[PDB]
Amino acid sequence: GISLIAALAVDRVIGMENAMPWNLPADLAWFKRNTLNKPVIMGRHTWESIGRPLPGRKNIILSSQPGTDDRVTWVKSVDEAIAACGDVPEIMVIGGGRVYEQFLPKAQKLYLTHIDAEVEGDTHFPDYEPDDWESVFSEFHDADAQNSHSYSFEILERR
Ligand SMILES: [Ca+2]
Ligand code: NA
Numbered sequence: 784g785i786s787l788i789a790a791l792a793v794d795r796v797i798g799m800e801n802a803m804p805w806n807l808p809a810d811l812a813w814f815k816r817n818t819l820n821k822p823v824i825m826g827r828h829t830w831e832s833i834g835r836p837l838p839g840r841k842n843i844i845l846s847s848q849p850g851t852d853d854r855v856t857w858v859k860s861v862d863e864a865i866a867a868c869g870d871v872p873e874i875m876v877i878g879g880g881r882v883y884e885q886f887l888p889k890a891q892k893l894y895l896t897h898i899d900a901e902v903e904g905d906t907h908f909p910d911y912e913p914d915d916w917e918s919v920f921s922e923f924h925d926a927d928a929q930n931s932h933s934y935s936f937e938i939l940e941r942r
Contacts, residue, residue: 784891785865787876787883788817791908792898798879798906806931809924810896813936817894818875822868826882830855843867845882861885880906887911893939900932915942 789797790810822841825833830844835854842855843864850857858864868874876886887909893916895908916939923935 785874785876785886785889786892786894787886787890788814788894789878789883789908790814790896790898792900792902792904794901794904795908795910796902796904796906797883797908799902799904804902805898805900806929807896807898807934809930810898810934813894813896814877818877821873821875822871824864824868824874824876824882824886826879829878829882841868880908884909891941893937895937895939897935897937898932899926899934913939916940917942 790807791797792803818837818840820839822843823837824843824845827844827846827848830842830846830852836842844850844852844855844857845859845861845864846857847859856867858867865874873892876882876890893911918937919940920938921935924930924933926933
């Protein structure tokens with residue numbers, strides 16, 4: 784199916800103009816664990832924030848304009864993005880806000896990191912009602928020497 788994976792500060796903030804004011808290697812490890820060797824769909828701005836392909840995966844970039852890096856696959860519509868993933872057990876949608884908004888109604892699972900941080904942002908994860916979803920996994924973690932804020936992971940499966 785289609786899954787979304789995202790890291791959310793309070794008020795569902797996911798993005799801003801500058802780099803996020805946190806350091807969460809545990810969230811990166813979680814992202815890798817759940818996307819390894821799966822196709823990833825991302826918007827063009829998320830692509831520019833990474834700068835290079837995520838290894839071992841089909842990288843699919845949504846843009847209305849021709850692609851500018853032949854190392855990844857560029858598509859001009861949601862339907863083309865899904866088609867480019869082919870026949871796979873799980874498609875991972877990795878951001879950003881505009882892309883999450885379009886794929887949420889298609890998604891069966893959400894992988895969410897909730898960060899105990901209040902940050903001014905210009906992009907939010909789309910609204911969802913927790914009652915429409917079942918929490919199948921949850922774990923809370925404190926900040927530590929490597930992670931600047933406390934955070935929790937949850938996996939929600941659409942009811
Ligand atoms: Ca940004
Ligand atoms: Na899994």
